[PDB]
Amino acid sequence: TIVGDGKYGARDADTKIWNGMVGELVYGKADIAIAPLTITLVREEVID
Amino acid sequence: YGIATPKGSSLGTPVNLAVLKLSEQGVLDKLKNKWWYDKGECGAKDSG
Amino acid sequence: AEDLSKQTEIAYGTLDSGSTKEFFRRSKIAVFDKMWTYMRSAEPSVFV
Amino acid sequence: AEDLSKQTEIAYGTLDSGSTKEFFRRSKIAVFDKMWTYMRSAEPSVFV
């Protein structure tokens, strides 16, 4: 499946929501993401 | 190269969150810029 | 990129946002921090 | 001293103690901090 918004996604500053493909792994709309997902700190604490 | 921990130990989550905080702040780079080039007998300026 | 530091007739730039711009801004390396100062005050904009 | 930074076949030094040695150690300037790293690991001693 292709993520709809076309973003890798980062945490919004105010609403604290995730968009994009990490928004599908945290919120459970998909089970795994084999994609160019750059290892950072803000993405380590929400998905492994 | 990875900092190792025994399997299932309590230092699995904070050690992992520490290394990605060090590479974020550039502190791994400033410690790799140093021990390979500060203690370097012939620097790139030196042969230059 | 050491030779991009000492030769400023070639204009180097990054994208308007992303992890690439955010790398040089928080950098404390002698090469990369000087390469962010040149990005900081150069007009026409190197940021695409 | 900018040309003492980029030309390390001339050996520059300070005295063993005093305010002159203590200036480069706490310095956060791109020229002077690199001029303290060259003082830091050069033997025979430039510190007289």
Cβ(C29)–Cβ(B33) below 8 Å? yes
Judged by CB atoms closer than 8 Å, whether chains meet at A39 and B17 is answered as no
**Number of residues assigned to chain D:** 48
What's the first-to-final CA gap in chain C, in angstroms? 19
Q: Please write down the long-range contacts of D35-42, taking CB distance under 8 Å and 24 or more positions apart.
A: D35/D1, D35/D4, D35/D5, D37/B38, D38/D5, D38/D8, D38/D12, D39/D12, D39/D13, D39/D14, D40/B38, D41/B38, D41/B39, D41/B40, D42/D11
Cited resolution, angstroms: 4.2
Within 8 A of B36 by CB-CB distance, chain C residues are: none
> What type of residue sits at position A45?
E
Q: Experimentally, how was this structure solved?
A: cryo-EM
SS3 A18: strand
Check whether the bond before C44 is cis (ω within 30° of 0).
yes
- Are C19 and A38 a contacting pair, CB within 8 Å? yes
DSSP secondary structure code for residue D39 in this structure:
H
Look at residue D2 and give its three-state secondary structure. Answer: helix
Indicate the helix (H) or strand (E) that contains A24: helix A22-25
Query: Read out DSSP for B11-31?
Result: TTHHHHHHHHHHHHHTHHHHH
Bridge partners (DSSP) of residue A18 are A11
CA angle D21/D33/B19 to nearest 5° reads 125
Query: Which letter does DSSP use for residue A14 in this model?
Result: S
Q: Which of D35, D32, D41 is nearest to D7 (CA)?
A: D35
Strand, coil or helix: C42: coil
Q: How far is C30 from chain D (nearest CA, A)?
A: 6
| 3+ Cβ–Cβ pairs closer than 8 Å linking D and A | no
d(CA D26, CA D32): 9
Is omega for the bond preceding A36 within 30 degrees of 0, making it cis? no
Angle in degrees, 0-180, between the axes of helices B27-35 and B13-25, rounded to the nearest 10:
70
Phi/psi for A11 (5° steps) reads -70, 130
